[PDB]
Ligand binder design. Structure first.
Ligand SMILES: CC(=O)N[C@@H](CC1CCCCC1)[C@@H](O)C[C@H](C(=O)N[C@@H](CCC(N)=O)C(=O)N[C@@H](CCCNC(=N)N)C(N)=O)C(C)C
Lengths: 99, 99
């Protein structure tokens, strides 16, 4: 697809059977999702956002689908205001920026 | 041009006669640059990200030159970790997300 930025690039992702809306975010190294429970063991991580730092829960090898593209990878769960699809999964689906 | 997400999408911008480096951020509504001396008037605003809320000095109709293309828009100056080019200016230089 080709997406323009007149509006927030919200997209539909399916994570473990459930459907959620996520924003394609080029400024995010990683993928951060709102609070939830995934199928595994988690480790602690600290991420830095604009307003400061947050502790998140790292899960690995998580399968997620993004607009029909399935991805497998690291997902961070924490107190984020919105689900964010970072570059770790953006690189996987073939996403690039163009002008 | 086409930008890949393997690394942080950093670009060089010229604002106020100064050359800066900034992140092409599709997750950002606006453009927020680190604390700098810029001439003009301004009114405060508040915004938030993953860390929380920050108070920024809002400046409007500012000319920024991003990778060769000139552009007019609002610029927020505050405690941002990195200079950010938000959707407000990414739209102006014709940037799209493709995958
Ligand atoms: C990982 C992360 O943290 N990466 C940041 C970018 C940046 C953070 C500092 C280090 C380098 C990378 C953003 O890429 C993520 C994005 C974000 O921080 N973007 C803000 C900032 C720009 C701005 N001040 O506009 C934003 O868009 N703020 C809007 C509210 C929209 C949120 N959406 C809803 N609540 N629905 C606002 N008007 O305050 C998420 C949290 C939504």
């Amino acid at each position: 697809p080709q997406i323009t930025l007149w509006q927030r690039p919200l997209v539909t992702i399916k994570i473990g059977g459930q459907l959620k809306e996520a924003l394609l975010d080029t400024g995010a190294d990683d993928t951060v999702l709102e609070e939830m429970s995934l199928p595994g063991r988690w480790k602690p991580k600290m991420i830095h956002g604009i307003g400061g730092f947050i502790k998140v829960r790292q899960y690995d090898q998580i399968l997620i689908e993004i607009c029909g593209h399935k991805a497998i990878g690291t997902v961070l769960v924490g107190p984020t205001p919105v689900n964010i699809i970072g570059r770790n999964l953006l690189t996987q689906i073939g996403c690039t920026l163009n002008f």
